[PDB]
């Protein structure tokens, strides 16, 4: 999930934008 | 980059997604 | 209450929804 | 939408929680 990818790990803009609608 | 957690993660999604909005789903 | 806009609205949803998360969809 | 109900108008917790998943 986003918490796993961006909080526990580090995420870039590409991954963050996957969660935009 | 940084780790992005909690309210900071929400705020990043808010800024990046703009008028599209976003879904924030822990779990 | 208050008007809740933009990052304040996002942050309110973050706090209220907790582990459920939320969808923020302008338009 | 949520912006209409909570930003332009004023919304309570009940309405805000409608947008939780």
Residue numbers in the entry:
A (entry chain A), D (entry chain A): 1 to 21
B (entry chain B), C (entry chain B): 3 to 29
Q: What's the publication's text?
A:
Two amino acid substitutions (A14 Tyr→Glu and B25 Phe→His, named OI106) were sufficient to stabilize the insulin molecule, with an optional additional deletion of B27Thr (named OI189) conferring further stability. Only limited differences in proteolytic stability are observed when comparing human insulin with OI216, OI106 with OI338 or OI189 with OI320. The reduced insulin receptor affinity increases the intravenous (IV) half-life in dogs from 25 min (human insulin), to 24 h (OI338) and 17 h (OI320), respectively. The strong binding of these two representative insulin analogues, OI338 and OI320, to albumin ensures that the majority of the molecules in circulation are bound to albumin. OI216 (human insulin desB30 back-bone) with an identical fatty acid side chain to OI338 and OI320 has much lower bioavailability, emphasising the importance of stabilisation of the insulin backbone. A multiple dose study wherein OI338 was dosed daily orally to dogs for 14 days demonstrates that accumulation to a steady-state exposure occurs after 5 days. In people with type 2 diabetes, orally administered OI338 had an elimination plasma half-life of 70 h at pharmacokinetic steady state and a relative bio-efficacy of 1.7% compared to SC administered insulin glargine, with no additional risk of hypoglycaemia.
Elimination plasma half-life of ~20 h in dogs and ~70 h in man is achieved by a strong albumin binding, and by lowering the insulin receptor affinity 500-fold to slow down receptor mediated clearance. The crystal structures of OI338 and OI320 shows a conserved insulin structure with small differences compared to the human insulin backbone, with root mean square deviations of 0.37 Å (OI338, 44C(alpha), Cα atoms) and 0.56 Å (OI320, 41 Cα atoms).
